């Protein structure tokens, strides 16, 4: 019988964000520099305002930065993970959650997860910042456990059900993504309800253009980042039907479950409606699943962690729905490669012009794998835990201690 | 025509919480000292764990502390408000939300509100911590506007629809509250699902005892603080029916909309089911309202603010439902006194043994009104803004600047 150490210390650092270096990248996908496609007139709930139409950074999509949580066992072995929360995430970990973590067995992952959820229920809002922090802790625990046992997380979960993960790429250049070997390209919408028919025409034209350049079998999708309403989304979906748009994603703010139900009903035959990257907690996904949307897309570092993701996958599978996580690099890879209902995954372009395979969480993760020819072979994930190390060369800040 | 100044500065401070003096009280109702009824074996989602059964403080219900937001106009006049968020709340205000606040007209309240909601949608979780912060800013803006104009908020909203507010008291001594003139007493449950039939018998006996001591017309209610499940809540409701329990409150975690719908359908004839203090954003309340519960109880400082509260009131009124806010002191009084569908209000006992009328937000609010024989006449509220001043004697901390 293998002997397991207890958890000795949990620490939290951050990089980027409003109190550090802007454009740090890492865990915060949107903490980028200038001239980045991810900040290029992307439609949002705020783009209706002239001062916040051109840049999401201008309204503060980058204020949080990256949260880093590292758990150390009594035998000095460490595990860690990253997410979006930054300094505030550090407060929550160092001043609150540490009490449920330290002293526990490295295998007490689900127990710590339940305690974190129960203890923060009064201020977590079931998603966002607080849940992102909880997720980071959950992931750091799985990493530590795997590194202690000496097994990749995907094997602890029950093994891979496919020999490689195939990816679609999210970014402004589906055509370049096809050349790279991805199976599809998801583009962000640039116009919203306030732009009316002109907005619909322009984004639909963008899709038509890529369909011409990419051929019929390369998938094309639209990401709407909570920026629309039911009528606008319905018009855009129908305007893109002639081009076989595979799915239209996150058209509405997360609380609008009733709206999603209606939008799905209004969708063109065969076109899928998806959402979920901003939802958190298993119960929220139960409600989301019942709206009838086709694919739920939780972010492993935002939905509650791997522990929660695995439950969401089961929920989707029980209904014949698919689960395709939002980015998340290795934190998603080790999980989805074991899900029969996750036939493909997402690679969210961090490359400013979507022309190169810059790592998903560059540069906070050392030896972070990237898709090669649009795929990641399971052997690439054959490393303890989530298989990566923390890049301490980055300027990690420790705002709190205990 | 009255001339209005622009907003010049917004600042945030905090007292109590994990990074300050424990038990500071103020905005955080649960940041109390020892031997307080509010921490005496109260049933919670965590009380199933032996180490967290006796005290909520033990799992961290008091880590946030009080957030204080003060907005200063170009003419040097100021407005402020308090809520539960502490240090992290200050980060959000000083490092993100300030951009939408400063430079605006003191009358641009709804505009700033929409911008705060839209800009934080990606990390707010539609409730909890981030929403508490947004709420505090919203209230500070209303306070400032009312003080600049020279009118009480209740008059800006369209005046009182009742000459006085009648209160029920929340605490361990309904019998004493009756002596104080209250119209009813709401008691917290001490046992949960894991305690089974014994737990139900005990809390039911507690109600039975107070019924005998308070008479038939004095209302009695149970607060369950998200600690139960449908079956347990149903058993307790029926076990308390013989004593004419007026309502059973927040039996389930906030995301369990479907559970609330079933519970309301299972409730004894005439007994009401309520919830809402932990919900945030108007859209969440739309979903909550559709479950059919009788009363929605948002906390003005947590639901999104007064701007949101007024919308929730209309939503409930359109359906014939009631809106009875959670505590909130003056932030509720000025709003509810104008709502036809808020026939009574809540006074959450801050007195350790519920023997005195210690102010709702003691001691952060100078000259804070309290019910006089269970009531607060509109004349008490006839002061600019929310009619109170900040207690600068408290050890306010300014963790961030901009
Ligand atoms: Mg997306
Ligand atoms: Mg309550």
Curated annotation (Swiss-Prot), chains A, B:
| Annotated site residue numbers, Increases basicity of active site His | 299
The record's annotation in Gene3D superfamilies points to: Enolase-like C-terminal domain, Enolase-like, N-terminal domain
Which annotated residues bind substrate? 30, 56, 346
Note whether Lipid biosynthesis occurs among the keywords: no
Q: What's the superkingdom here? A: Bacteria
Q: Which HAMAP family match?
A: Rhamnon_dehydrat (MF_01288)
Q: What does this protein do?
A: Catalyzes the dehydration of L-rhamnonate to 2-keto-3-deoxy-L-rhamnonate (KDR). Can also dehydrate L-lyxonate and L-mannonate, although less efficiently, but not 2-keto-4-hydroxyheptane-1,7-dioate.
**Name this polypeptide is given:** L-rhamnonate dehydratase
